[PDB]
Write a protein that binds this ligand. Sequence first.
Ligand SMILES: [Fe+3]
Ligand SMILES: [Fe+3]
Lengths: 165, 473, 474
Amino acid sequence: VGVRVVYARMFFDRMDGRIQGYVDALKARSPQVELCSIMEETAVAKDRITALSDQYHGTAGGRISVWPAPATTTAVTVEGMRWAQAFARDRAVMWTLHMAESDHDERIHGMSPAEYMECYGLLDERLQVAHCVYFDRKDVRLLHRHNVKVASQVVSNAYLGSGVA
Amino acid sequence: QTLSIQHGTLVTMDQYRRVLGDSWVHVQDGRIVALGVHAESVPPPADRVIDARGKVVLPGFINAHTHVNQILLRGGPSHGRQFYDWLFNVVYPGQKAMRPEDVAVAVRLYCAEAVRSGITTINENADSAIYPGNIEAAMAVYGEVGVRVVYARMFFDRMDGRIQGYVDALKARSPQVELCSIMEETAVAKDRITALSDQYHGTAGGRISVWPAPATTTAVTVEGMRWAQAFARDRAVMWTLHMAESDHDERIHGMSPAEYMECYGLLDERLQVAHCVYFDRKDVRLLHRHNVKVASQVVSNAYLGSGVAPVPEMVERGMAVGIGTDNGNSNDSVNMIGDMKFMAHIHRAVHRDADVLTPEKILEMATIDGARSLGMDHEIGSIETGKRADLILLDLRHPQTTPHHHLAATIVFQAYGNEVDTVLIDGNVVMENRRLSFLPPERELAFLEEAQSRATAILQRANMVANPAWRSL
Amino acid sequence: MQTLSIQHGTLVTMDQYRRVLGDSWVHVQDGRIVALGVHAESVPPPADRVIDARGKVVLPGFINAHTHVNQILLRGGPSHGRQFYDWLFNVVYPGQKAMRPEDVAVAVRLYCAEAVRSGITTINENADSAIYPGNIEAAMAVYGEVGVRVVYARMFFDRMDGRIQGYVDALKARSPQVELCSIMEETAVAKDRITALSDQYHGTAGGRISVWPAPATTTAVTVEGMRWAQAFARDRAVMWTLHMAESDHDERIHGMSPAEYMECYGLLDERLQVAHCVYFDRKDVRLLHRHNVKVASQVVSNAYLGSGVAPVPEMVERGMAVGIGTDNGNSNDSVNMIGDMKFMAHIHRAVHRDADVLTPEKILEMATIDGARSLGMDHEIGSIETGKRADLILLDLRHPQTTPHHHLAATIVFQAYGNEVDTVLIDGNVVMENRRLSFLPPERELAFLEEAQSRATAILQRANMVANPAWRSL
Ligand SMILES: [Fe+3]
Ligand SMILES: [Fe+3]
């Protein structure tokens, strides 16, 4: 096609046991539709993403890139996010993460996702966060301090009834 | 022995709030035995006369809730952190790294600053009493120094499994600093505190007291709190508890801490609660109903980013609300006058009301009301016959306190905290013309260098960053 | 050609890289900082005098971004417990009116004594009493003698706000024996008087004194008056300043915010310094930001008068130049930069429920380099850099309250009381040394304070103001 593409390969290496009951209820809305899991072991994800990068990064005349994309702060281990952060740094690319897209997400371990990331040194200039709806003054400040990049999905935030970033 | 304080302006904080120009106080065997006006009466003869000419005499300030040892952790390591972040990455590890000889220095440093700022009574909430030799080291210094001390021995007998993941995350901020636990079995705590009380309660000429201090409603069992409540009753003292200091400390078992305590019959007139930031109208009502005493740590509540307690609401209901400086390292000063000023302003600002708390009232919080909040208002907090001679002399002959007409206003809105000149505790001269009896000027600089050095070493031992990199945002 | 060397200090430069230089020295000549160095790497030049700063911390002099001096004689009982307009009309105006020039001279010396003691080297005097004859002359003589750096922002009012009359009459009934005063003046009269004042005093006392026009507020000044001030500032390469939205009775001029109104008339520019931003919304901040408007935040005073809490963190996070002002000597009621810095740090942490909303470093910047920026003077003052003026202070942290100390900004903001300043240089001149004031020596201090006390008492008698109200707990 000839389009310029960043292929941000998403991964999930952690079960969020807190919201299963809520998901089972949601599934009952369409019970004939199957409940799916795309979880994978941390090491398997690393391997798969590294392989993908080695194979496709820089291809199609420089038009294609590959980044690691830990899905969210609740669906990914600290080890997984640290890996992605290191990977972005070592290969001069970015890493990206979905952050606080619903009200069921906006606490992880008694703090905001941005706060939690700050605790583990996970906010840096090579991070691009997506979905900043459930953000407070402090979260903004943290992202600003570390020069975090942002992608706002304004229409979608509306479509899904999340709100306004 | 006898002491006569003469030609002062007496700000009594007595029943009628008398302010007595050119007047005198007669002190004997640690008690205020008489007062008079110089124009109407002649002071009794006395062993010693202190000339207070052109000076203001107050009851000694009362620090309703504080933590002393932590003072060695101020100066860089302690700021910028929410309550639990501060607690687990700074306070616990730092305290753990402290040796008894370090504690002795901390206490003397704290007292030096406190007395300098007019503070005569201290409610020490002691979280490091669990470590061997610490109590003995501290008590020796409190005794020597001559300050009036409530030693509130804190205990924790219950794990709060609910906040584990939060804490682990917080610890990752300083992963080189140890995660510490000072938990102890209920019976062990009872024994240790009872022993401590038996040994030290009433010592240093009645100047030292001991109370039980269940840490919080989430870190202490019902059995533990009931024991403390009963203990206070049986021994005619108080018990104290930290209540709702962060939004994670908010709801215990689906209700507020005050609600939870009410359920178990744990709110009574001998309870002094500290930290009332996360309080609602109902919580206030409950505390009011049972005549619970309060200590407000207004500066610290700000320092740690907790928020602003409903002090005016409590005060307007006649509740006994004292002022506490809180930790030496969540303030980061031990200066009642600076904290009074802050109490006055923060509440004016938030309520958008320039008269929400009169300076008179703020001054009452620091003195007579504070005494009340410690259950000690029969013994201290005012210049009245029969009460202990805990007294302070202020000199307003400085630029910042000029002019002065209304004394409360001048003290609250103008004074910096360096205007206290002479301090008497239990009739003993503990400071005179800013010269400290327990830390003479020829020894002062060397002592501060020792405190600096030990502090630095404590931080090395605890693996704590003393001086973080310049940071504007 | 005369010279001064400050040695063996820790230099907190507030320079471009925020350098903190241990065991280092500063060379001063002809009022300017001419060099700096580290003792281990270099030898200080010879100098006429050496000041040993061993074991001491060297900072740029604090900058009081917005204050009112003369009112200091009205502190001590008469001034507290009142909302802005109550305070203004029952205390400030009548009290100021009752002041004679000899009274003003004492006020200014007392103010300066306290200020210099607390490390303040530059003062933005918003002068509301310049309309009374002899006052300017008396004040300027003292500012000059004392050696402080002064911006004299001559306030004017050329417009009656008829909307607020009934409110004021009701307020006056609180103290009906005190006179209702007006300091209004015709637009052209104000222009003439300010222009004369500028011509006469701008640049005097060895460059230490400046003059700015100061239209009081958007409701008390005509558009023509504000435009004039704006043009004046531009033409004479100075600033103009305006009090903006300090009470909820101000918050709406002609159906919009003061900032909105000013925007409509092209009255927001980079030479404007606004004071008091309590009643600000997002949009107001945005407007100020767009035009690079400078700000002075009077955090303590906003509390004292029960106005509220300004959105300082919001403005600072946008890189705006926000300085700290102590405001009135009688709406604080101290002249103590260190105490006010502490308050700035805490009030905003508390309200935002955020322990790190403003770093102590940032607070310290507000008091120094950022404050200089907010006065349009950051090329001359606010940091320890070669080429800038030698406005410098020495702090001794060898006291109980500032022990221990590791991180200097944290220590100063969270621990220091304001009495730790030792030596103060302004424009290279030694104005205070070991707490001994050059313009108020210790053998003369107590007598002077007794004079200030007396005069204050007398001023209140003349104005028929209650000095010491009855004890009141509720
Ligand atoms: Fe506490
Ligand atoms: Fe002002």
